[PDB]
Design a protein around this nucleic acid. Sequence first.
RNA 1: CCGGCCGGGAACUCAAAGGAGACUGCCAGUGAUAAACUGGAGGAAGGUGGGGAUGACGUCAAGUCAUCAUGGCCCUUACGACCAGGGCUACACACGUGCUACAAUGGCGCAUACAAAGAGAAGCGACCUCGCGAGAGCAAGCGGACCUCAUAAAGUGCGUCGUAGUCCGGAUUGGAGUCUGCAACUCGACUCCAUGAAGUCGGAAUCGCUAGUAAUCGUGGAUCAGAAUGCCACGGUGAAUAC
Lengths: 98, 100, 114, 151, 206, 127, 79
Amino acid sequence: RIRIRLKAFDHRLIDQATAEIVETAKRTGAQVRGPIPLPTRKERFTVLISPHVNKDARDQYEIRTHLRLVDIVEPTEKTVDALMRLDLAAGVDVQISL
Amino acid sequence: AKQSMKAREVKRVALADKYFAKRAELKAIISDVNASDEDRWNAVLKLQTLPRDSSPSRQRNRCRQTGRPHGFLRKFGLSRIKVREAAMRGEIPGLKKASW
Amino acid sequence: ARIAGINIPDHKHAVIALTSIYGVGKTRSKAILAAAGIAEDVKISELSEGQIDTLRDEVAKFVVEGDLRREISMSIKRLMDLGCYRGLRHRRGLPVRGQRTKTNARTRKGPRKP
Amino acid sequence: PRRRVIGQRKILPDPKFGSELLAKFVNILMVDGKKSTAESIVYSALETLAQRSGKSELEAFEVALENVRPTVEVKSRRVGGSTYQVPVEVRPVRRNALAMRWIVEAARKRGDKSMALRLANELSDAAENKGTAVKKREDVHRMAEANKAFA
Amino acid sequence: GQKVHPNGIRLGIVKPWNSTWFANTKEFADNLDSDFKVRQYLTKELAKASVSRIVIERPAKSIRVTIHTARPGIVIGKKGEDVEKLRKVVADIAGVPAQINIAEVRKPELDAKLVADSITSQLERRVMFRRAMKRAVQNAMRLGAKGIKVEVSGRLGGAEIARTEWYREGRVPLHTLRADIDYNTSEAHTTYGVIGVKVWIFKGEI
Amino acid sequence: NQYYGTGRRKSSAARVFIKPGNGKIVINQRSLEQYFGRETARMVVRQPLELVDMVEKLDLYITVKGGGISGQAGAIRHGITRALMEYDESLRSELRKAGFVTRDARQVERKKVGLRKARRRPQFSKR
Amino acid sequence: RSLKKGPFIDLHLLKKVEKAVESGDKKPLRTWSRRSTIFPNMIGLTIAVHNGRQHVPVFVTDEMVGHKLGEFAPTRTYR
RNA sequence: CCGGCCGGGAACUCAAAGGAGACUGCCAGUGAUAAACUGGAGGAAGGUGGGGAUGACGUCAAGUCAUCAUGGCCCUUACGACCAGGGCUACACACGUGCUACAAUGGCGCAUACAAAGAGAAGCGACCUCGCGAGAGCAAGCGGACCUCAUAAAGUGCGUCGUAGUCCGGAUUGGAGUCUGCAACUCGACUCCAUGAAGUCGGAAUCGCUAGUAAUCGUGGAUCAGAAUGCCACGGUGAAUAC
Ligand SMILES: [Mg+2]
Ligand SMILES: [Mg+2]
């Protein structure tokens, strides 16, 4: 019921943040689904660098924004009891949608 | 970096959103498929008064620290020369240099 | 072959002739053949006059060559008498399809004199 | 360049019938990468030549291959400074390509109808030795016979 | 300008970040502006107290500010009254709750920015730029420094022209995209004009 | 029974299922002459079978997408070799000599800064 | 081309003519609103349309129906 | 009600992570048996396999004090501040990089295939009505592998055009309009209706490219109220030669 979709920057961070969620919801939360890769966006764009001149000087900066899904199916109350006001892997953004 | 120019954006933005730009009550209603009555003139009746200072089309949508009309990015808030210096310094969450 | 009394668009499809006509081009040819009831796959050297007179009448509704340039000259007189910026640009005898003239207007400003 | 002395790529034969010769013949006329139409027209021209000559394609041209292919070329090594003709042996590795280039140059001529009619016509004229690609064969022979035993 | 900043290439690989907060493309500019303003106010107000680096984070809009200094005795002041006061200023400027965390550096000669600030303060005294640079680099190499490169550019010593001088001791592999280095820059507006410094210090391999 | 073949030239994903008993062909519920049976690569999908058996021994069910016509057509020419495993030894030791098994890892190089294309340098002036 | 529903005009231009037409306007009018067009009421006028250095005085004729004031302001000196 | 539409599986594409492998690893030989290099089989992958960012001391006291700051100096009821309109788009003329054409491996009309990549909340806007059309009204859904931008396009076949400035080609203005923004001529873009050039593939001279590149076909992102052939990117088809 809880369509869990989170967005983060790094994969080594989103995985570490989903680990605690998929441990809490299993020790208490009744058999959530499987973490879902959810293809991601990176915002590959061209920016510029040199002052005043040399238009041929550019930089290619990107922001790889990883996305993941869990989609808890059991509407047990222990799910929320464990997901009650916890924020791990600060620097990311999760959401609890039903 | 003309203080005055930067102030100009300030007095522009200070009243654009405080005024008709978001309070678009007069124009929105008027320019429609309604009767071709006095409302047609009424539309510009207010605009002639309107401080020109205030509308979105007016503002340049430029940087804030430098006050530079060019190179600004609508998504970061600063010019190219400053945003790059901050990027390769670390003050841009999750933004780095990649290749293909 | 004889429409307009002057033009002979012989060996041209029912519509290719009308497009080749002075006065109208691509769309009015099809409009004419539709309002008159003819196909657009046969030349003009096969159609009898019982239909060519009807095509002539059907084209006699819009402005014709004899009046096309007259309307154009009337607009030009309007411009020249107004004295507008466009009237001046036209009276200076310069190319005419648009706005830009400085460095690319050579097409109707002719080649370079010096 | 100066460092590497690599050769040419491999030729991908035709999906119809294995012919690197015909593959190169098609790739030489190929232009702009719009290959669907090029293939559709060249294969049609060739299947028409098939009956135009009475024999299949791989042999329809084998008769004019020799008519077109010369046995000489020119390379002007400067001799204290020189830029005129100097006869040399033609490389058969790319003489087939040179022939495919000359025959398409000629087929672009005779221009009244589509290519499918004119390139097959020029190949037939080459088979009877009646094409500018056949005349280039002698042009280079003339240009080579002038200065013998140069280098 | 051909030498790349040898930290922008190592940030998302081996080096730690400094502004850590995810969001959508609606508040990026506002948050980054608030952070820049508060951070420059901090580096202005606590300059004389060794701010080595200042890292920022914004969890659910209750921000955290980590400040790595060498003189925490004066940062905390009297039981942290200055800390809780600056906590009010950060919250006022950022429109959000603030949490401050003071970290301590053991040897201030492990921070490129801190040694650059030391040199900046030294060169505003009509001091000998060599007696400063060589002294700093040897101080670092004695306590242990697998690599160091310190360059100074400008009107050094009244050269009256664009002049640069660099000193190297050890290995400074700014091309190997595997190591960890510390690097930063500083500027001294001596009465002569300005003088820029570039300091790279190489300790880590992984 | 059933054998699966994967294919990938130029971003072109090909998914093939081959069975014994018949030798028909269907490309994404379409026939060969329906999609490209008379176009470029109209036969590359048959070469791997023409090498051993094509007519009626092994019937195919194909699903190709993710690019151009030639892309999907080479994707099949490949996926056939990946599905041809029922006698993998004789289907590979024989075909590896003729090809049809390589991925052909060709990727269009990105639009390069400065350059107007992947490799073309802009036009100079020299003066 | 321009507005589909209501030709755009300015008030400083409108009001000075609309109310003075009863008088004849007796004189030129310094227009700083050249971005406006004409209508059958604004003919017979002797208005000075701003063009930069000065305002060019122009008499208005019935033929200037759907044309603007700056349409003929010569900022294109060119000798 | 053939829409993966609904059960159903995680078989499969695909997906984002973690690993695998490739290294001259093996065989032949000219070679100082060395190294290396041509080759050979295996080899998804062959010699740094994709390419990309990575620019070492340094050179032009190169450019940039109009990104920004600082010296030194000038001014200061003015070199400072504000308001409206013109300008940078004014053009006898020079030059430089790009889009369009000079056509029949092509133009025109029918139907007809598959992309990939990115955007989208005072924003992207299906559907549906009207309008030839530019767009205008209703307006869900979507802050997004789900909703939208958004239909890829050359292509595929058929029919016509048949060598002429010709159904080519399209340009600097007429008239009627469509949107943007208070505002569209001086100075935006777009459709329609209409006129229709030059150019018949180009002198000296000169430019790019060693492969999925050249050549082109379209597509999207920035900037942005609106405003490209330009800039940055996506993928589509697809060469020749390197003696
Ligand atoms: Mg002109
Ligand atoms: Mg210079």
